[PDB]
Design a protein around this nucleic acid. Structure first.
Ligand SMILES: COC(=O)C[C@](O)(CCCC(C)(C)O)C(=O)O[C@@H]1C(OC)=C[C@]23CCCN2CCc2cc4c(cc2[C@H]13)OCO4
Ligand SMILES: [Mg+2]
Ligand SMILES: [Mg+2]
Ligand SMILES: [Mg+2]
Ligand SMILES: [Mg+2]
Ligand SMILES: [Mg+2]
Ligand SMILES: [Mg+2]
Ligand SMILES: [Mg+2]
Ligand SMILES: [Mg+2]
Ligand SMILES: [Mg+2]
Ligand SMILES: [Mg+2]
Ligand SMILES: [Mg+2]
Ligand SMILES: [Mg+2]
Ligand SMILES: [Mg+2]
Ligand SMILES: [Mg+2]
Ligand SMILES: [Mg+2]
Ligand SMILES: [Mg+2]
Lengths: 175, 252, 190, 109, 139, 201
RNA sequence: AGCUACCAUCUGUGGGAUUAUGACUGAACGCCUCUAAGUCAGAAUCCCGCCCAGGCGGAACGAUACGGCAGCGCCGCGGAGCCUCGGUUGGCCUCGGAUAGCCGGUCCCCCGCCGGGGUCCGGUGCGGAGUGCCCUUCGUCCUGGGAAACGGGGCGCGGCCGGAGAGGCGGCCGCCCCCUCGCCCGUCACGCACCGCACGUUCGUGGGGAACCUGGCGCUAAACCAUUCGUAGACGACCUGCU
RNA sequence: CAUAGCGACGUCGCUUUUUGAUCCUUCGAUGUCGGCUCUUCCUAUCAUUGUGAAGCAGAAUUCACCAAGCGUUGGAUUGUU
RNA sequence: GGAUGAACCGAACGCCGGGUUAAGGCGCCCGAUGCCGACGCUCAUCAGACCCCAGAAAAGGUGUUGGUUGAUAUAGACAGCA
């Protein structure tokens, strides 16, 4: 599974009806995939791991994107997950600040890849939930709980380094 | 494989270009470090190897077996007729190194000195420095000379004097004088420039530069041996008598 | 993790003033003037009031390593204040088993000569850092008094003296001779 | 009266690492260092002007040493304002790093 | 040292990106890199925005963080940011750059003539002042 | 471009500036670099000194005279660095390599002219402030370059004369601003024209 | 004599950054701590000096070709022309520097009337801005209003100063001769207007080589071979001498 | 008294200076041991310069680090390595 | 294309023009990121830099970054001093 800007998907599926149970139970999952096809594939993988289901043995009845109910509000996300490291499987709890749940999941993917070399295929996201500022446990997130937050931009790096490529004046980084 | 026993290397790698010297005189390549604190003094001189002999003296070295005893030590005779300073060169420091800024030659260059400029003195018209010396008389020429002196004063870092020997005082066949740049040390640039100007056309006896019982450095070109084999050129080991294609060689 | 802001404020006494030229700290006290710049650390320095002279050291968006620099700067500033107000006097005691250590305090206390360290014929010539005055204590038989304004210079001179009398090729645990710093103290005891 | 053409540099031929397509060439128009700014110069006539030993006929003038290899810029190249030019004859390799004029002849503005 | 800070109500100028050349007000701070950004009167709907495309100004509004569009818009209109900004040297420098860029050939010709005459007069006055200042001789 | 491009080496990184120069000389452009001793190299000084000593160790064991010519002058070092980014074994590379001139300090042909600065190679913007860096002048001085002191003295004299020139130019600019103040009733007609089209805010 | 031997005799050198290590201040971690920032000492190692050679690398200076028509140098952008090599298509004539800060101006202290300091006032997404500045070419003729008129032009002469890191450059006076022309807005018409077409527009009197004429100002030499030497040497080369 | 100096039981590496395994090159030929001579290189450092530790009192010795600049010899026996 | 390589990756071939790509790339060599690329980690006095592939293991680090589990704490922790 590659990445991009992930999207939440409410995936609903069930087994094929059989002459043992005419109405098999439905199962609903939240899957974060770059596209709905990958969402369906991951849904089949997860239901095969948890229940005794196969993609051929069952069917998917609904697959739609889950839009963020308040993308204009800053909120704290608590994420539970497990991943296979180079020497086994471990459980983690991470915290992020983002407007969208899917963006928070993408941030979690990028952070895990950056810190633990965890490729996307090795990561099992098991719980995503918005949390209050009081329930946050990571100080890197808790330090943004300031009603009077204030900080400058200390050392601004020049980004337009090639327009011009040659000039007479040395740039100023103080602003 | 390793050689079975270690041995010090034959000869020195500090003299690798084992070639005939490109010069017959022997240049200084490093003058003593100058300080303005010392009085004005020359740093070099020219001499001719007259010969060798031995002397008898008493040694005043306490703690030695030869203390207050008589010793016989070989000495070398170097005839040194007084040098004649005939010019001044001023050098300026550059990031590319020292370079010749300006050169001033004195009037009335000695006849033996003028012989150096000619490969064939016999066939020469003896025209060397004839038009140059005329600028020591006209007022415009002396103004030019004073301007050169002022430029050397305000720009040059180290100055050196051109001095020549005196063949007519020596029993050699050669009448061609030996020219040399000699560094003038010990003072400010203006002081040494004036001091050199007061010594133009003059004689500098060897006593004014070097003193009694002081230790100096000798620069020269060794005796020529012609084409020599490794046995004499490097003092390598001679191969045994049984060797077929030669015993005065390097085996490997 | 980059901490948003880490700051510590150092109070300045009324008898001494501090002037800032960017990150160069000029401290002028009754004992003299000490100047030290911190151009190698990218922090913010500011003077707070005209009443009590609070100095604050600010570092914005710092990782774990550079956060340690704030208190280092604060301690250096306090050391400069202590030096310009009270000064730094280091007391070194010379110890020996058989050969007494003869110490000659040469001109203005800038040069210290050791004669009979372990009885060897060598003489140790140690030059003090500028602004540091060394002297022989008049209250003790074997004590060297080093006085100066800058703590680094005084302690560096003391370390030079201590390392100058170093036993070699011997079991230093048994041969304990040398000059060693007894205490690090102040002048004027205020 | 005026320069009346833009300065450009024959940077080189269209090429891979070990293959060289000499039938088309890459040019560097001075002051154009982005791909979006290359639209104005697409389709413009471009000429390579040089001198030689023998006199050649000059349209509207006396014969002289000036020789021209005509061409026109086809499409943008890269993202740093590079452009591609197809000439009537393949450019001689001695012109690499020399002046190429953009003649503004096909005006679309 | 620092005179301009990132805080709620701070007015920032957009350097590049989709909303370049617009004034916005910071609403909240996100992960050291982004911020809740709102221009209610400069036609910039609420959205996240990286700090790298921001250039801070000296206008600071006074509204609670994460407030709705209404209060931010009232804080913008009261003590009008637009009129005060337009009087600043920054905004008029931007305007001068924009009108210089859109100057036509005729405008270039007129500007060249006017600058010719202006520079000639200024240089004449400079020469007059030099010669007036050259008559100095005092022990 | 057609003119000679003068680049000041102070505060510039070695690799970035060398790559930019090598790209410039390939375009048929004349490049002159002054004050090459002011070039900074990323990484602490000891590591770069070890790198240059390792370069010194690489020599032809059979005949060091034919071996790699280790140049010790900072300008020569930068010249060799640029030569590493060019096909200097070809005629095109040599022709490009002849368009580059490098100097320690600023020579009299160039001290009376303005000097460009490349933003993409400056140490201030291409290096994190917490890092350490190595001066090319100091590194050359401790490895075999011989003329650091005389270069510093000549740069000191050039700075003195440049300060005199700067004070003269400040006097001229002050007098120009004064002249602008003296005459505006005969200037405002054109001033409004210039202010209308963006020039002269 | 010459050559020659620890088989005789003489001579063999200075400095820098630093490794290991030992320390200082000092947090990180209200204690400590050689380390994180910043500092000190430090060696048969390393590098440089001394020494040896001297780049398809440079410097300064010398003298630069006859007594006959004979060569050469400079001055004239002097002329008429040839051959050859092609690039290019306005200039910017300069602070130092910092980036957790800069830049400008001004009132008081101190150094030769100009600078360094302490105040105060401004600018800072740099506008006293290289995203910048200067100049800008159609030309002439009536023809007014402004700018100026203490103004520009002199390949015009003479004088002076500054520039030495590669000064190959720049600046300032005196005399003489010009026009009141050139700069903006206006008036007035004219020019080959070559009938749609490309290499046009500059550096430029470009670089280099032979040659003619036209004038002025100046000069009259070396190298090599041969020979001689032996401080040299396979031969060359090298050190010498020759009314 | 584990670790001054060693290290059983186990266990992980490095070298191509030994000897093995293979037969990829060489069978219209790459002269095969050893010795002599000579140059350079490596360090897993014997000594020397500078250090740290010891069951380092001194001496002597051992262990360890920076370290390959300098040196590592004369002989009886054996063709010898 | 992998610098280079009988086997690897892509892709198999009459001679050309235009266009688009694969594998792989886009500081300069050397065509292309001269994107105002996004997020984080990392200082190495033998750093690191791309299948095959051309160099490394066990064991450690109070260097730094996350994460798990547990414990103490205004009924005053922890660390210092007594
Ligand atoms: C019986 O002993 C030999 O084989 C040595 C010799 O005969 C030496 C002859 C050399 C001449 C000049 C006569 O060709 C010979 O043919 O050398 C061969 C030789 O011919 C040149 C080839 C070898 C193969 C590769 C190198 N050459 C190296 C010498 C050698 C040494 C040997 C060997 C074979 C080779 C060969 O077996 C054991 O030790
Ligand atoms: Mg050996
Ligand atoms: Mg035989
Ligand atoms: Mg002997
Ligand atoms: Mg303390
Ligand atoms: Mg250390
Ligand atoms: Mg030191
Ligand atoms: Mg054979
Ligand atoms: Mg053979
Ligand atoms: Mg080792
Ligand atoms: Mg002992
Ligand atoms: Mg050696
Ligand atoms: Mg291939
Ligand atoms: Mg490869
Ligand atoms: Mg094709
Ligand atoms: Mg490549
Ligand atoms: Mg390219």
């Amino acid at each position: 599974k590659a990445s991009g800007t992930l999207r939440e998907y409410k995936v609903v599926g069930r087994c094929l009806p059989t002459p043992k149970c005419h109405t098999p139970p439905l199962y609903r999952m939240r899957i974060f995939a770059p596209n709905h096809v990958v969402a369906k594939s991951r849904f089949w993988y997860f239901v095969s791991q948890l229940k005794k289901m196969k993609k051929s043995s069952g069917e998917i009845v609904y697959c739609g994107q889950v839009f963020e109910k308040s993308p204009l509000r800053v909120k704290n996300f608590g994420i539970w997950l497990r991943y296979d490291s180079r020497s086994g499987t471990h459980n983690m709890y991470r915290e992020y600040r983002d407007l969208t749940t899917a963006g928070a999941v993408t941030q979690c993917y990028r952070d895990m890849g950056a810190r633990h070399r965890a490729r996307a295929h090795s990561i099992q996201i098991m719980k995503v939930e918005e949390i209050a500022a009081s329930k946050c446990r990571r100080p890197a997130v808790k330090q943004f709980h300031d009603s009077k937050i204030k900080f400058p931009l200390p050392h601004r790096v020049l980004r337009r380094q090639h327009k011009p490529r040659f000039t007479t004046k040395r740039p100023n980084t103080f602003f | 494989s390793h050689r079975k026993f270690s041995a010090p290397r034959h000869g020195s790698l500090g003299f690798l270009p084992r070639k005939r010297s490109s010069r017959h005189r022997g240049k200084v390549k490093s003058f003593p470090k100058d300080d303005p604190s010392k009085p004005v003094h020359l740093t070099a001189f020219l001499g001719y190897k007259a010969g060798m002999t031995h002397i008898v003296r008493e040694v005043d070295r306490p703690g030695s077996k030869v203390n207050k005893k008589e010793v016989v030590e070989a000495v070398t005779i170097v005839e040194t007729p007084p040098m004649v300073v005939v010019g001044i060169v001023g050098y300026v420091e550059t990031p590319r190194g020292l370079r010749t800024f300006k050169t001033v030659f004195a009037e009335h260059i000695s006849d033996e000195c003028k012989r150096r400029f000619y490969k064939n003195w016999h066939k020469s018209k003896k025209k060397a420095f004839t038009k140059y010396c005329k600028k020591w008389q006209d007022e415009d020429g002396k103004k030019q000379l004073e301007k050169d002196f002022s430029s050397m004063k305000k720009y040059c870092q180290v100055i050196r004097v051109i001095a020549h020997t005196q063949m007519r005082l020596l029993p050699l066949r050669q009448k061609k004088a030996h020219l040399m740049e000699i560094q003038v040390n010990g003072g400010t640039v203006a002081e040494k420039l004036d001091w050199a100007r007061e010594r133009l056309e003059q004689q500098v006896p060897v006593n004014q530069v070097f003193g009694q019982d002081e230790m100096i450095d000798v620069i020269g070109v060794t005796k020529g041996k012609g084409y020599k084999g490794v046995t004499s050129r490097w003092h390598t080991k001679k191969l045994p008598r049984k060797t077929h294609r030669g015993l005065r060689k390097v085996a490997c | 993790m980059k901490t948003i802001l880490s700051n510590q404020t150092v109070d300045i006494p009324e008898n001494v003033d501090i002037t800032l030229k960017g990150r160069t700290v000029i401290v002028k006290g009754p004992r003299g003037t000490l100047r030290r710049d911190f151009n190698h650390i990218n922090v913010e320095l500011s003077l707070l009031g005209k009443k009590k002279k609070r100095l604050r050291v600010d570092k914005w968006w710092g990782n774990r390593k550079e956060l340690a620099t704030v208190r280092t700067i604060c301690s250096h500033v306090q050391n400069m204040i202590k030096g310009v107000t009270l000064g730094f006097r280091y007391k070194m005691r010379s110890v020996y088993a058989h050969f007494p250590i003869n110490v000659v305090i040469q001109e203005n206390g800038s040069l210290v000569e050791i004669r009979n360290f372990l009885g060897e014929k060598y003489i140790r010539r140690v030059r003090m850092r500028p602004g540091v005055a060394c002297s022989v204590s008049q209250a003790q038989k074997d004590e060297l008094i080093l006085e100066g304004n800058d703590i680094e210079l005084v302690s560096n001179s003391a370390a030079l003296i201590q390392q100058a009398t170093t036993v070699k090729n011997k079991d230093i645990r048994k041969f304990l001779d040398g000059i060693y710093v007894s205490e690090k103290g102040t002048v004027q005891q205020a | 009266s005026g320069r009346l053409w833009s300065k450009a540099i024959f940077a080189g031929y269209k090429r891979g690492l070990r293959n060289q397509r000499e039938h088309t060439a890459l040019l560097k128009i001075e002051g154009v260092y982005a791909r979006d700014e290359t639209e104005f110069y697409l389709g413009k006539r471009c000429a390579y002007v040089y001198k030689a030993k023998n006199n050649t006929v000059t349209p509207g003038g006396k014969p002289n040493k000036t020789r021209v290899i005509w061409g026109k810029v086809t499409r943008a190249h890269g993202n740093s304002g590079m452009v591609r030019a197809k000439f009537r004859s393949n450019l001689p390799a001695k012109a690499i790093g020399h002046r190429i004029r953009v003649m503004l002849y096909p005006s679309r503005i | 040292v620092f005179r301009r800070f990132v805080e709620v109500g701070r007015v920032a100028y957009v350097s590049f990106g989709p909303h370049a050349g617009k004034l916005v007000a910071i609403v909240d701070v996100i992960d050291q890199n982004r911020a809740l950004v709102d221009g209610p009167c400069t036609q910039v709907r609420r959205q996240a925005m990286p700090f790298k495309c921001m250039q801070l100004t000296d206008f600071i509004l006074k509204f609670p963080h994460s407030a709705h569009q209404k209060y931010v818009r009232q804080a913008w209109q009261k003590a009008d940011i637009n009129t005060k900004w337009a009087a600043t040297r920054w905004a008029k420098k931007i305007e001068a750059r924009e009108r210089k860029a859109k100057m036509t050939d005729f405008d270039r010709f007129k500007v060249m003539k006017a600058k010719k005459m202006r520079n000639r007069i200024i240089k004449n006055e400079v020469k007059k002042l030099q010669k007036a200042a050259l008559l100095k001789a005092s022990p | 471009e057609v003119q000679v491009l003068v680049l000041d080496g102070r505060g510039h990184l070695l690799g970035r500036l060398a790559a930019i120069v090598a790209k410039q000389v390939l375009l048929g452009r004349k490049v002159v670099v002054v004050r090459c001793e002011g070039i900074n190299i990323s990484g602490n000084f000891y590591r770069n000194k070890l790198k240059y000593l390792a370069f010194l160790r690489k020599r032809m064991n059979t005949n060091p005279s034919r071996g790699p010519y280790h140049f010790r002058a900072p300008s020569r070092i930068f010249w060799r660095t640029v030569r590493g980014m060019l096909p200097h074994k070809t005629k095109r590379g040599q022709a490009a390599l002849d368009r580059l001139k490098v100097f320690d300090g600023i020579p009299p042909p160039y001290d009376k002219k303005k000097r460009m600065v490349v933003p993409a190679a400056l140490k201030v913007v291409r290096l994190k402030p917490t890092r350490k860096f190595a001066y090319l002048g100091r590194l050359a001085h401790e490895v075999g370059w011989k003329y650091q002191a005389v270069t510093a003295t000549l740069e000191e004299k050039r700075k003195e004369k440049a300060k005199i020139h700067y004070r003269k130019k400040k006097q001229l600019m002050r007098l120009r601003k004064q002249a602008e103040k003296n005459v505006e009733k005969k200037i405002d007609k054109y001033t409004e024209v210039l202010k209308t089209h963006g020039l002269l805010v």
